[PDB]
Scaffold this active site. Structure first.
Site, PDB file in Angstrom:
ATOM      1  N   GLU A 147      -6.007  -3.431   0.834  1.00  0.00           N
ATOM      2  CA  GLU A 147      -4.735  -3.472   0.099  1.00  0.00           C
ATOM      3  C   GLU A 147      -4.962  -3.473  -1.412  1.00  0.00           C
ATOM      4  OE1 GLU A 147      -1.815  -3.083   1.132  1.00  0.00           O
ATOM      5  OE2 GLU A 147      -1.754  -3.566   3.254  1.00  0.00           O
ATOM      6  N   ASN A 175       6.471   1.690  -4.446  1.00  0.00           N
ATOM      7  CA  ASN A 175       6.762   2.347  -3.174  1.00  0.00           C
ATOM      8  C   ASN A 175       7.840   3.405  -3.359  1.00  0.00           C
ATOM      9  OD1 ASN A 175       6.146  -0.325  -0.747  1.00  0.00           O
ATOM     10  ND2 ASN A 175       4.912   0.306  -2.516  1.00  0.00           N
ATOM     11  N   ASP A 204      10.691   3.694  -2.091  1.00  0.00           N
ATOM     12  CA  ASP A 204      12.060   3.194  -2.103  1.00  0.00           C
ATOM     13  C   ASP A 204      12.408   2.482  -3.409  1.00  0.00           C
ATOM     14  OD1 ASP A 204      10.726   0.770  -1.975  1.00  0.00           O
ATOM     15  OD2 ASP A 204      11.618   0.186  -0.019  1.00  0.00           O
ATOM     16  N   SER A 213      10.801  -0.254  -4.601  1.00  0.00           N
ATOM     17  CA  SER A 213      10.183  -1.571  -4.618  1.00  0.00           C
ATOM     18  C   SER A 213       8.746  -1.410  -5.105  1.00  0.00           C
ATOM     19  CB  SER A 213      10.249  -2.235  -3.239  1.00  0.00           C
ATOM     20  OG  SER A 213       9.455  -1.444  -2.364  1.00  0.00           O
ATOM     21  N   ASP A 270       4.659  -3.223  -4.682  1.00  0.00           N
ATOM     22  CA  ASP A 270       3.759  -4.170  -4.001  1.00  0.00           C
ATOM     23  C   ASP A 270       2.875  -4.881  -5.023  1.00  0.00           C
ATOM     24  OD1 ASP A 270       4.665  -3.289  -1.440  1.00  0.00           O
ATOM     25  OD2 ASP A 270       3.107  -1.714  -1.453  1.00  0.00           O
ATOM     26  N   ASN A 284       5.567  -7.118  -1.112  1.00  0.00           N
ATOM     27  CA  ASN A 284       6.602  -6.195  -1.588  1.00  0.00           C
ATOM     28  C   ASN A 284       7.839  -6.881  -2.140  1.00  0.00           C
ATOM     29  OD1 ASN A 284       9.178  -4.311  -0.669  1.00  0.00           O
ATOM     30  ND2 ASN A 284       7.440  -3.077  -1.350  1.00  0.00           N
TER      31      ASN A 284
END
Ligand SMILES: [Cl-]
Ligand SMILES: [Cl-]
Ligand code: NA
Length: 129
Positions: free
Chosen positions: A35, A46, A48, A50, A52, A59
């Protein structure tokens, strides 16, 4: 902060993540490697809108506030920037809530695709824990 592998394993253990909801410490180390490369400062947008954040790429749509994710929630009650600290306390506390959500560690896409089903004990081999 970029952790060493055993340095992160020790910190996760001390924070009580080892065997948390049945996931052995190597699972968490493996998840952090893919990650974030063990880098607390990692951030990734991301599709959408958002973002991380941190060693376990938590998120902003559900878990932390970053002030720019409309319709989002803040279920860990924290600024997303707290997830970027050299101190992993907030990330660990929030991960404990995420992993308790119903899907266990399948919430972490990189865990499902690169760690699940593998010899994750290898991520802590050599470590003095
Ligand atoms: Cl393990
Ligand atoms: Cl589970
Ligand atoms: Na949010």
């Amino acid at each position: 902060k970029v952790f060493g592998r055993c340095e992160l394993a020790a910190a996760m253990k001390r924070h009580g993540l080892d065997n948390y909801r049945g996931y052995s410490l190597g699972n968490w180390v493996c998840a952090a490697k893919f990650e974030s490369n063990f880098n607390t400062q990692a951030t990734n947008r991301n599709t959408d809108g958002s973002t991380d954040y941190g060693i376990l790429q938590i998120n902003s749509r559900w878990w932390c506030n970053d002030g720019r994710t409309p319709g989002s929630r803040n279920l860990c009650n924290i600024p997303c920037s707290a997830l970027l600290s050299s101190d992993i306390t907030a990330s660990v506390n929030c991960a404990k809530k995420i992993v308790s959500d119903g899907n266990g560690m399948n919430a972490w896409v990189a865990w499902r695709n690169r760690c699940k089903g593998t010899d994750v004990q290898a991520w802590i081999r050599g470590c003095r824990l």
